[model samples]
Target: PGCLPAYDALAGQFIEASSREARQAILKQGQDGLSGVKETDKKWASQYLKIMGKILDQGEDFPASELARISKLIENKMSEGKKEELQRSLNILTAFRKKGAEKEEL
Candidate 1:
């Protein structure tokens, strides 16, 4: 619900930064692209998703070869109440990987 789907003409290179900046940028991007987001909600959103990036700390790429391990890592870091958020994020990763798969088939 954070962002509306949009066409991307540039295919700009992905930006890498410290986890804090990544959190800020991704949430900012979400806020910028989305509708109906509240200020308070946007304020808290980055700290919420920031846990996911630690997966990269192990030198494993996002959507790491083992999605199960990635799930486990999220479970370990996240609270029970955050299950919905965790699942939402994992779903995004799944969709992202699937999109990449189609490109590779070309």
Candidate 2:
């Protein structure tokens, strides 16, 4: 299976894609954003992770909009508010990533 359409639903940061390629694209989109991240700048993973959280919380109705958001983030630009939001979401993403890894091992 691709990353997984449904993982621990209680955990945040989830997005269900029609294909693994799209899911991987979303994954790549976040990592690519991180390619140029700096210590001074909030990481992009924080941004996408929150986006994933929203999609997960909101359910299947969200993929189209969230994917668009991911595409925009991949362009590597962030507004002041967006930066703040990304910074705030980092901690959640850290745990989400950890939970994801744990589930993947099983």
Candidate 3:
């Protein structure tokens, strides 16, 4: 979780975002945060950020399909040790997605 703080920021912004422009701004800030990650975590953090950008691009709707893709990528591409390390970040993402989806239903 080298970039966990960034993920936490993203989750907070995602919950508060009421407009597409706000979400886009959050994605930009999220990408900026990737540069602060350690070299050892660069690849994983970059991939996670890229997928997060894609999810943000969908606008208004909850990105169920993209989340599914994230699950598959983590299962197939990440090592077991890395998965444990990433669990908290993944939980942050899942929590935000759930909140966003619930918002859409209201």
Clashing pairs for model 2 are none
Cα deviation at 57, candidate 2, in Å, is 6.1
State the weakest 10-residue window (summed lDDT) of model 2: 1-10
lDDT of each: 0.43, 0.47, 0.63
Could you tell me the lDDT of residue 82 within candidate 2? 70
47, model 1: CA deviation in Å?
10
Per model, how many backbone clashes are there? 0, 0, 0
Q: What is the per-residue lDDT of model 3 for residues 1-106, given as tens digits with 9 covering 90 to 100?
A: 4335556557567657877678778777767876876766656667656656666665434346544655766777788877765564556457657666666676
Order of models, best TM-score first: 3, 1, 2
Model 1 alpha-carbon miss at residue 100, Å = 1.2
Which digits, one per residue and each the tens of the lDDT, describe model 2 over residues 47-82?
A: 544556465556544655544454556457888777
User: For model 3, where is the 10-residue window of minimal lDDT?
Assistant: 58-67
Write the residue-wise lDDT of candidate 1 on 1-106 in tens digits.
3211221100111123335456456645644644444545544444323423443343425555545554775767667757666675555455444444554564
Q: Highest lDDT, which number?
A: 3
Using TM-score as the measure, which candidate wins? 3
Per-candidate TM-scores read 0.38, 0.28, 0.52
User: Pairing residues by index, what is the TM-score of model 2?
Assistant: 0.28
Candidate 2 — which residues are off by over 4 angstroms? 1-71, 74-76, 90-94
